Amino acid sequence: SFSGYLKLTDNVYIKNADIVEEAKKVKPTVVVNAANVYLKHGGGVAGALNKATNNAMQVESDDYIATNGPLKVGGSCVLSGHNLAKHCLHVVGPNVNKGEDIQLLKSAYENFNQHEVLLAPLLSAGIFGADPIHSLRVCVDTVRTNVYLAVFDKNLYDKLVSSF
C-alpha cells in the first residue's frame, strides 16, 4: 500500500510527506509516534497525530499512564491507532533539548524490530533536538524490519537523500 517512496536499503524507504496524511491514506498496521515518557502529545509529530484523532489518542494515553506510570527514554508501548492505523507504537527517543543521552537513540529504534512493517518519523528529530542525518543512520543500522519513513520538511528530505 505504500507508494512514492525512495528505497535507501533492503528494508528502509523514505518519502517527503506529512505522516498524518500518509497514515490516513495507507491505514498501516503500525504508525510510530514520536512520544515522550508521559505520553503528553502536545506538539511535533505527537501533537499532529493526536489532533488527527480528535484527542482520542490523548484520552487513551492518559488512562495508560494512570495505570502503568511513565515509559523509559528508549522504550515504547503499543496502543490503538484510532482512525490512523490498526496500532500506534509510541516510541520515546532521547530529547537533546531536555539533556537526554543521544546513545539511547539506538535502543529507541530497536522497538521497531518487534513489528514487520511500520510507517514512522525519524526519532529524536525536530523539536527533540537531535541531528536528523544521525537519526537516519542509526535507523538504517538498527532496524531490520520494513520501515517507511515520512519526512515532513522538504528541505530536510532533500538533504537526507543527498547525504546518505
Ligand X SMILES: CN(C)c1ccc(C(=O)N[C@@H](CC(=O)O)c2ccc(Br)cc2)nc1
Q: Does 45 bind ligand X (CB under 6 A)?
A: yes
Q: Does 71 bind ligand X (CB under 6 A)?
A: no
Closer to ligand X at the Cβ: 20 or 73? 20
Q: Which residues face 68 on adjacent strands?
A: none
Q: Does 74 bind ligand X (CB under 6 A)?
A: no
* Half-sphere exposure for 3 (CA within 13 Å, toward CB): 5
CB of 37: closest distance to ligand X in angstroms? 18
C-alpha closest to that of 57 among 9, 90, 102: 90
CB of 132: closest distance to ligand X in angstroms? 5
Stretch that binds ligand X, among 17-25, 62-70, 83-91, 97-105 (CB under 6 A): 17-25
Q: Which residues face 83 on adjacent strands?
A: none
Phi and psi torsions of 137, nearest 5°: -65, -45
Q: Using CA atoms, how far apart are residues 104 and 1, in angstroms rounded to an integer?
A: 31
What would the x/- binding string for ligand X be over residues 103 to 142, using CB under 6 A? ------------------xx--xxx----x----------
- Answer whether 90's CB lies under 8 Å from 37's CB: no
Q: Which parts of this chain interact with ligand X (CB under 6 A)?
A: 18-20, 44-45, 48, 121-122, 125-127, 132, 151-153, 156
